[PDB]
Every structure is written in C-alpha cells, then in structure tokens.
C-alpha cells in the first residue's frame, strides 16, 4: 500500500505525513494523452476533506492556480518517491463529490498548460538506480 | 457507519435523530460540477418514506422551496458533523421510486445558490475550525 | 420479505392472499418523473400468470382500463400496508415475457396513466395505522388535486 | 427444471419426449410488445441440433412456415403444460449459432402475423384451476 | 470437452489430431444471419499459432482462398463429427491477436457460399443420418 | 507465466532479463486488422517505469522511432521465443498512466507503424527451435514483402 500525494497551490489538503504536510491524500488517479496531441485532464480521487470546499469554488470560478504536484511514494523498508508529476498553470475542471452510509469519495479533474514527469529507478537493494525526467509546454506545443 | 441527513423546507422526512428530527435519512448522494460552469443536479437516495408523496408533488408542480440542507455526521465516539451543503432556491427535478419483494427512491435537486462547509476535527475529536465557500450559481458570482 | 400487490381493473392476477385475492403478485417495480413534467411509465415484474394473456391482449389493442392500484405491505408481526399508488385511466404500454429451463418464468410490464395518487401510511408505536400523507395529480390535466 | 418445447412446421427438432417427439428442446426464450403496437420477434435458444441446418436455410430464403407452437411444461409430480404460445404465418428472422470447447448454443428469432396465448392455472393440489386464452391478428391489427 | 477444427485452404494450423492434421484447433466460434438476408462474418478464436502469420497476411492483402471447413466433434466414447460448416470463396476480414503474462487470437471470415451439415447420432453412437442445407449467399440462391 | 518484452529504439525499459536487458516488460497487449485494410494501433500495458517519461514525451512530440520489437517467450524448462512482432517506423499514439494506493501503477500505451513483420517460431520435440513461419507487409506502401 503505497502513498499518493497531491500538492495544489492555494488549496490545502489535510495530510499528516511528515514530508507532505497539508497536502491532499490521493486514493487513485489517471491521465491520458492521445494523437498536435490531445491532452486529457488528469483525474484523481480523494476523501471529502479540507480541500473540497475550495475545489468546489475553483471549479465554479475557473480561476487558475500556479502549480499542482502529484507524487507516488513506495511503501515499506525503502520508501522511494519514484514518480512525480508537476503540472503548471492549473484549472480545476471537474468536481464530483459523493457520500454513503455504508464512505466519502470525491473525484476531481485538472487541466494544465505545461507538464513535467520525473521517474526514479529503484534497484533490488532498494536504493536509487537512476532517474528520467521529461517536460513539455502543452499550451505552447514545444519541448522544454 | 456515518449518518447523512437532508432537511428540505416544506418537505419533512421521518428521522428520529435528536438533532435532526423530521429530516430525511439519506442512504447515499452525489453531485457534479463541470467546466460558465455546468452545475449538475444533486441526487440522493432514501427509503420510500413520509417525504415521498410530497417529493412526487413537487416534482410534478415544479414549485420551488427556499432551502435544502445536507449534512454528513461521523460515526463513533466523536460524532462530528463535518460536511454541510446548503442549497438555496431548490427545485425537485426528478423522483424515481422502486420496490422489491427481496424499497428505495432516488431524488434529484437543482438550486440557484450553494454553500459548502467542511468542519475540521481536532485531535480531541472536537471542532478545530472550518473551511467554507459559497457561490451564486444563478448569478454566476462568488459570495 | 415484504408483499407487493397490483390490482388492475378487468385484469385479474392469481394471488391467494386474503386481503388481495385475485390481484397480481409483484416481484419488483419502478417509476420515474423528470422535469411541464415528464412522467414515465410505471414498470413492474411478475411471474407469467393468469394476468399474462390479458396483459398481452391489452398491450396489442391499446384499450384503457379504469384503475390500477399498487400496494406495498411490510412483512412480519405488523403487516402494514404502507404505500398505495393509485393510477387512473391506465394503458398497458409494454409486455416482455421470458422463460428458462433452469428455474423461473417472468414478465416485465409497463403502464401509463392520466392521474396518480400516492398515499404513505405512517406507522404508530404499536405497529398500527397512525395516519397518512397523501398527494395527487392530474397528469393529463397538468393540475394538482 | 421445467421443460420448454418449440414445434415449428416443416422444421423438426430432436426431442425424445413422449408428448413432444421431434420438437425443438428450448433452453430459454423471450418476446416483447411495445406501444398500432410494435411487436418484436420472439427469440429462443437451443443447442445446435437437427433443426439448425433448416433454420439457417429459412433465415436465408425468408420462406414462411404455417405455424410455430411454444410450450412450457412444469416439472415434478404434477407436470402441467401451463403456457402455450401459438404463432401463425412465421418467418425465421435471425439465426446465431456458436460453439465452444468448454457447449453449443444457437439463438433464433421468429416473426409472425398472428398470435395466441393460453395460460393454465394450477392449484395447490396440482390440478387445473382454470385457463385464460387470448389471441390477436397482428398483421390485420384486430382482436380474434 | 468437444473438439472444434477449422481447415482453411492455404493456411495450415498445427493440430496433431489424427483425422485433422495441420488444421487449426478452434477454441470457440460464432456466426449470424439477419433478415436479401444480411449474413455476418463467421468469427473464431484460436491460440496464436503457425496459422497466425498467414492469417495476418491474408487479412492485409484481402486475397481469397477457395474453402474453409469448420467441424465440431463430440467428446467421449463415441467421438462423432456432428456439425460441418463448409465456406466457399473465403476472405480473411479481421485478425485480433493478443497476449498476456497471466495468448489468443480472434479471426473473422466472409464467404460467397455456405453449406451446413448436421450428423444425426444413432442410439449405438454411430451415424444415423444427416440433415443438410446449402446456399449461394453471393448469388442469393438455394443450392 | 510467460514473459512478454517490447524493445523500442531510443526508449529503454528497465527489464533485468538476461536476453532482454533494458527492454520494457509487457503485462499484456492486443492489436487489430480490419477489412485497403484498416490497421489499428497496437496497444500494450506495462507498469509505470523508466520508459514512461519518454513515452509521454514522444506521445506529445509525435516524433518517430525506427523500430519496436515485441516478443513472447514461453515459461518453463524450454523458454522458447515463439512470437516476434517487428514494427518499423513507429509513433507513440497514446499514453494512459494511472495509480492507486491499494496495490499497482500501470500504463496503457498505443503504437502505430508503417511496416510490420510477424514471425512464429515452431517448436521441435526437444523444446528447441524447429523452424519458423514468417510474413511481412508494408502497410504504408500497401504491399506484401
């Protein structure tokens, strides 16, 4: 059971994690690019939490935020942050809260002008094996 | 197992909860906002109950009600009311009753304005603070 | 396990229940109203039974019947009839029978109606009738009643 | 586990049942009428059997057959034929055979000019409790 | 557990069955005719095997083959070949290979003419007779 | 449990397999040709890995790569590489990453290509290479090769 965090400028979550205080604890996420290219929103799920009233507001106003950063960190003896997705000039495009007597979930989508992806390689001994980083100005349709 | 309540002006439920007497006991609910913005109906499910004949009536007439308030309350030793969604100038847009031998009703609401309050819980289980936003959907303005 | 009954004027079922003799025993049902308003057919499922050949006939002719009454009754020690849906000026709009060798033969049926009344019966502490909440509407005439 | 039979004029099945010799043994079936009225095909499933090559032929040619009769008969100590659906002037509109290493099924549809439905009521003692029969000339849009 | 074989002219499989050497072993299949008549492709599934590279080629070229023959054979003590479907002037219309770590390929065929033979089994498990029909789909005539 | 590998020129994976070092370990894949002919993208799934940031980049730029080779190898005592699909002049048309707290992070990727070759390796009785059946096609040029 790995940890997934999302840090959205101006929209705090309620994580108690030492390295990700006040970020949003993410249950799951997905994203898509299709063939210039068609870049879909990134979508994530979290519990209804401290971020939710602000996520609602930004969805309605459409106001941009500077940056959102998504991180996946492996669980266990060697807890590496192995994937980091950095989104610049972000819009909250969709919010879908729900609740049940038997559970509170809220599904959120984000669009962004630029993106950067960093992946860290872990070796069998658990240390850093290398790293790959790429980035792209989607709005400007240019490599960065 | 948390409790969810909905208080609709002019349409009583039959809850026996001390702090929510005659409100509607909600089984589940969902809502959506999409990118001015497209705000979807809020939908909830409840058992067929004392509210149902009036929900049917309002669905048919289209008459507005002043306010509906949805509350989620945590279960357990510290039963905190941590989410409050206040809907102003409400229409009953849809009612979908059903029953089986082996009985539930799905209802949708639309509203001119909305307020969402999340109540932050402190380490002792009490109120530590809140985050609150509101919006005039009809007028397309922050409030 | 609650009981659900449907009484359709001129189309008997084969229920043996004392208070609902010759009515249709309903397995399940559903209905919908959408925003003047759009009122959908009411749909129910029952076993292929004595009603089925007449339901077929009425589906084909389109002939109206005066009234259909749907009732749900709680199971157990206090069998309260807690929901009564009365549909006036009714058409059989859909019939969908089926069967399988591996038991079960069922039929899905839909109804349309000019007027509707919904009564919910409130239960008292002794399990008896404590009162009711009732509403009604002339759908065809688009008026509250 | 009840028995279901279909007797199609000119298209024999391979049933060994005393009362339904050479009829088609039916696995399941369904039918539909919608609001003059829109009468859908009746559809049934059977194993690929002696009828299948003829069902294929009639589906391709579109030649009519005089009559098809579907019967459901209860299983057990009191085996009543409680539902009989009689279809007149029948067309084979669809045939969908399939097979598997893990099974042979074939789905068939029928359309018809006229229909008759007979239902027999069974009492708790297992005997005949009464009967209801209706019929309709669909092509002519008239009660019969 | 019955056996299903497909013999396609010019496209060998790798079956080791004595009576169907070098034919394709079929996992499942289906076909459809709808109401002159609309005859759909016949579709079958097999493991990725020796046929696959040629199935890919014919799918791409659209070149016809003379004949494909599908046979179902009963399992057990009396392994009767009870269904034979003969397809004449065949096109490979579709190939859908796939594989997973935890490998199958779906193929579709179209044809100008068809013959279906069902072999009737006698009480001793032998051939008791047959029912046979055929049709020129392309020419829209019985044969 | 068989192994599936994909070698994409200029986009390394992180496989540790001796005969497929730094290739992409594939969880599953599928492809389609329909009736000149309509050749669909090949789609595969892999874990989010060293390839992923480059796959994203190439999806966005649309830049071609020379070749991608997909291989399936039987598991067990005789690990035969029995299927080899060689795709020439390749575009990354689709990337779909996802992750969940409850383990697993996976990514679905699609490829398009101008030419294709499919080799199936026939296995001999000893489990070794007995031969092959091989075909190839210039999809862009619409010609058999």
GROMACS .gro file of C-alpha atoms in nm, chain E residues 14 41 48-54 56-57 59-61 91-103 105 110, chain F residues 1-5 25-35 37 39 72 82-83 116 118 120 122 133 135 137 144:
model
   58
  590UNK     CA    1  -0.064  -2.713  -3.624
  617UNK     CA    2  -1.876  -1.276  -4.081
  624UNK     CA    3  -0.158  -1.769  -3.159
  625UNK     CA    4  -0.009  -2.049  -3.366
  626UNK     CA    5   0.154  -2.142  -3.700
  627UNK     CA    6  -0.151  -2.005  -3.886
  628UNK     CA    7  -0.122  -1.656  -3.737
  629UNK     CA    8   0.142  -1.503  -3.963
  630UNK     CA    9  -0.052  -1.620  -4.267
  632UNK     CA   10  -0.220  -1.162  -4.081
  633UNK     CA   11  -0.101  -1.167  -4.443
  635UNK     CA   12  -0.612  -1.005  -4.368
  636UNK     CA   13  -0.384  -0.741  -4.517
  637UNK     CA   14  -0.387  -0.850  -4.883
  667UNK     CA   15  -1.183  -1.377  -4.726
  668UNK     CA   16  -0.996  -1.313  -4.400
  669UNK     CA   17  -1.173  -0.998  -4.288
  670UNK     CA   18  -1.026  -0.943  -3.942
  671UNK     CA   19  -0.746  -1.056  -3.714
  672UNK     CA   20  -0.718  -0.957  -3.349
  673UNK     CA   21  -0.421  -1.107  -3.170
  674UNK     CA   22  -0.347  -1.052  -2.802
  675UNK     CA   23  -0.127  -1.189  -2.526
  676UNK     CA   24  -0.091  -1.168  -2.151
  677UNK     CA   25   0.162  -1.265  -1.885
  678UNK     CA   26  -0.106  -1.413  -1.658
  679UNK     CA   27  -0.233  -1.580  -2.579
  681UNK     CA   28  -0.638  -1.453  -3.149
  686UNK     CA   29  -1.656  -1.389  -4.502
  720UNK     CA   30   0.354  -1.739  -1.660
  721UNK     CA   31   0.514  -1.641  -1.991
  722UNK     CA   32   0.730  -1.335  -2.050
  723UNK     CA   33   0.648  -1.057  -2.294
  724UNK     CA   34   0.907  -0.796  -2.392
  744UNK     CA   35   0.833  -0.578  -1.957
  745UNK     CA   36   0.481  -0.608  -2.103
  746UNK     CA   37   0.186  -0.719  -1.891
  747UNK     CA   38  -0.047  -0.763  -2.187
  748UNK     CA   39  -0.107  -0.640  -2.543
  749UNK     CA   40  -0.351  -0.652  -2.834
  750UNK     CA   41  -0.375  -0.544  -3.193
  751UNK     CA   42  -0.627  -0.549  -3.476
  752UNK     CA   43  -0.659  -0.553  -3.854
  753UNK     CA   44  -0.996  -0.493  -4.028
  754UNK     CA   45  -1.102  -0.501  -4.394
  756UNK     CA   46  -0.719  -0.277  -4.500
  758UNK     CA   47  -0.466  -0.149  -3.943
  791UNK     CA   48   0.658  -1.354  -2.632
  801UNK     CA   49   0.780  -1.821  -3.015
  802UNK     CA   50   0.637  -1.493  -3.138
  835UNK     CA   51   0.509  -0.500  -3.985
  837UNK     CA   52   0.534  -1.140  -3.780
  839UNK     CA   53   0.611  -1.752  -3.533
  841UNK     CA   54   0.784  -2.365  -3.450
  852UNK     CA   55   0.668  -1.920  -4.036
  854UNK     CA   56   0.522  -1.284  -4.309
  856UNK     CA   57   0.383  -0.618  -4.507
  863UNK     CA   58   0.340  -0.760  -4.946
   0.00000   0.00000   0.00000
